[PDB]
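User: Show me an example of a complex going from sequences to structure tokens.

Assistant: Sure. Here are the input components:
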Amino acid sequence: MPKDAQMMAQILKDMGITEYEPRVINQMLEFAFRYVTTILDDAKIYSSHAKKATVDADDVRLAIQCRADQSFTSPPPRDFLLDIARQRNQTPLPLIKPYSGPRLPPDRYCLTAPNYRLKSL
Amino acid sequence: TPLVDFLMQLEDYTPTIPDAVTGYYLNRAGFEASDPRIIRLISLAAQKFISDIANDALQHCKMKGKDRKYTLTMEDLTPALSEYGINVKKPHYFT
Amino acid sequence: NQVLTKKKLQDLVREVDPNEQLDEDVEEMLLQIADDFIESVVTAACQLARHRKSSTLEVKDVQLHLERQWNMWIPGFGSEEIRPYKKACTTEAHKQRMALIRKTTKK
Amino acid sequence: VNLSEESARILATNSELVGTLTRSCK
Amino acid sequence: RKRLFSKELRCMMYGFGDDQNPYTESVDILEDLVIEFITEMTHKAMSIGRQGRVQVEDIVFLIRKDPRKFARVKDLLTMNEELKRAR
Amino acid sequence: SEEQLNRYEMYRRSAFPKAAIKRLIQSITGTSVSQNVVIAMSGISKVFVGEVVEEALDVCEKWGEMPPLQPKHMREAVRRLKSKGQIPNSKHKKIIFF
């Protein structure tokens, strides 16, 4: 147990994870090695783009923020889900026809189709 | 029809991946494969991909020059996977 | 103040297959996708420009965002000559720690 | 000496035939 | 940068069916494409095989997938060997 | 005919000069290359130009235009070649599994 696998068990214990597989700590160290060597990948591309010698802290600060949109994109925020809902929640509920049998969407949104197959010649 | 012509050629090739293995991984993907030729085509495509990665690894190994037995070490597979969309990054020397 | 005007978009469909129409929903969504792409590219390029401690958006940092993320090389502009490619700046600490993985493995 | 002077005659005719006027485009 | 392939590329576009007098902007696009292709091939060649050296073997492995380019490299090398033998 | 014989002359005799590509590659490596590298690298780039112009004349024949090649047929040529993997970019780390 290295000092960063002894600290990876502390992180999962600080969460609600008391019983985990022992393969998890080997997995959470490969993710933590792939992440810092992808940030420092982009932090070396940005140091050469500003044409400096070393990798300063403002390069790593940009490399963190410029890959929080594609590598770790988020579920939509609460201020956006409220505005999408409160215009959807204002149209009234439609009425129901009395006898329509199976009630289904139009035929281009359902999965009912003639569903062919090849002639096994 | 190119796909139909390829299926006619396949009417002889038997893939290494069995039909029960491929026919199970299509079941987790969302359908039960009824026609046993679709299973064959998918298995053959997968076999070609694995063979290409392995052959690229063997070519890097042969290029480094040792010429008796070729070991599939991670040093030959990790650059050979990056030509496709598999980017592994394995650590060493955990401090 | 709109950048795409539904006639340049219609010719973009006519150049692919001339017997093809888009619906109103598809046209609106395509305009929205174009606007979103422009906004993302501009913001990222502006952040790179702020990083070069400059206040002018050159074409050298709209290049670096499209190549690295969107897989787009726009040909007809030309760059400066690329410096000699530095291959491996492997440090001494890695040259001595990796010379301990082999020392335990074979000896 | 025969290879040195004849090499530039394959390229000298490649500046008399092709590209007489220079064009442009909007 | 100036254009190092302005007059040479106009002969080549005529060689593949363009015109006797192509447009300057089209010649410029082609020149930029050629420089980018050469740079990409050189970086991959430096990575593959001997690090920091670009060799014919590395270039051949890189072009192996594309049939038209691989055939041309093999033909040029064989013809070069034959011409050296004739000399 | 009399144009096909002139066009076949330019298809074979045209080449990038070896005195400039050896200057161009060595500005990327740092030290030195060999003559059999420059002979191959000058030959692949002629195939690559012939990969674009033979395909940019397919864009022009598809649309309703004539043989003079506008840049509209040339940006579309690089777009269709890149979607078939022909144009390599070593700065886009691609990912196939999602």
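The lines above are the inputs; the final block is the predicted structure for all six components together. Residues 13 and 22 of chain C are 8 Å apart (CA to CA).
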